[PDB]
Amino acid sequence: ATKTLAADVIMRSPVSWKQELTLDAGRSKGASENMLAIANGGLIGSVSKVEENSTIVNLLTNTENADKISVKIQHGSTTIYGIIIGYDKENDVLKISQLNSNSDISAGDKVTTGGLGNFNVADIPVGEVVATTHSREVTVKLSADTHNVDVIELVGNS
Incomplete structure (x- = not known):
């Protein structure tokens, strides 16, 4: 049913840009573009881009x-x-x-x-x-x- 993955935030967007996080896991560790992001008690965003080694999360x-x-x-x-x-x-x-x-x-x-x-x-x-x-x-x-x-x-x- 479910694929899960833990990753750390390694970048935040510049003040006033699209609110987004960069994670230290991408496609090489199983990140996919259909994934949702959970943190600090619940849904915090959705994946917007998957790279080989990082992922961008839309907040x-x-x-x-x-x-x-x-x-x-x-x-x-x-x-x-x-x-x-x-x-x-x-x-x-x-x-x-x-x-x-x-x-x-x-x-x-x-x-x-x-x-x-x-x-x-x-x-x-x-x-x-x-x-x-x-x-x-x-x-x-x-x-x-x-x-x-x-x-x-x-x-x-x-």
Whole structure:
């Protein structure tokens, strides 16, 4: 089902560029472009580039997210799926949209990866719901701590 890999952060992006990490493991140790990145309590990003000996991880704290990372939200008995669409830096909440249901979503509801699309590994903690927005979008407080991301677990479908 699953290939896992531990790696260390060896570079961070320049201030104000795309928020991304460089890891000291790439294709020679089993990193793949379909992998998700776990650190400091949960999902911290997705792989954006795999090299022979290093990997670039796109971080969840990027304001816009085009990577269509599949997530699901558990509301009691119901599971609502959607995708991560961005991050709110001021309020420090992940943004989720394109929800496949109009069911009730409540603060504290648990958000995990859904294992659909390209980042096809389910059940990784993302966080818990903070609010539902309309102006439908969902805001989520990440489990992963965003400070001092030094060691990442890379996980992908085998």
